[PDB]
Amino acid sequence: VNPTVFFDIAVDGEPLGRVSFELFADKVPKTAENFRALSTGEKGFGYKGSCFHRIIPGFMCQGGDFTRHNGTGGKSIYGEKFEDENFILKHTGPGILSMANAGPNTNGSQFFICTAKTEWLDGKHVVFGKVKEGMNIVEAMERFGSRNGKTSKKITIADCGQLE
């Protein structure tokens, strides 16, 4: 029942592989549906073609700004922003998928994949999924980041959709 979407990653044009996530629609239905819908492109816009604008080794990989591509844009399938659904799920380890935000109740389209356990973010960022397969591709992406997050190469979401 919980959806499974995927992202085919490409660094400067060459495929790196497919990463798939399980979205916990059973605990954060509104947040999960936002991500599912952005992955299939059914509302007319979404992640296909977007890039990871902030990558920080040993922390996380951030993307989802399909409008400004700099972490200033993005929008949800509800409006530019939506409230923090709940904080039931915590940042337990690598692979956790969570919402990036500009403070409370500012969820849009930006997300981040954790490569470490980021407990200091619990209760501030809504966790809504986890990497199902492909964790090694995410670690490989870290090699293109920097202490501050600026990327070394153009890491994009070549394609995406729903598997289940």
């Binding site: 996380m60 951030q62 990036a100 500009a102 981040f112 997050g149």
Partner: peptide
């Protein structure tokens, strides 16, 4: 916010 962020994280940065």
């Amino acid at each position: 916010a962020x994280p940065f």
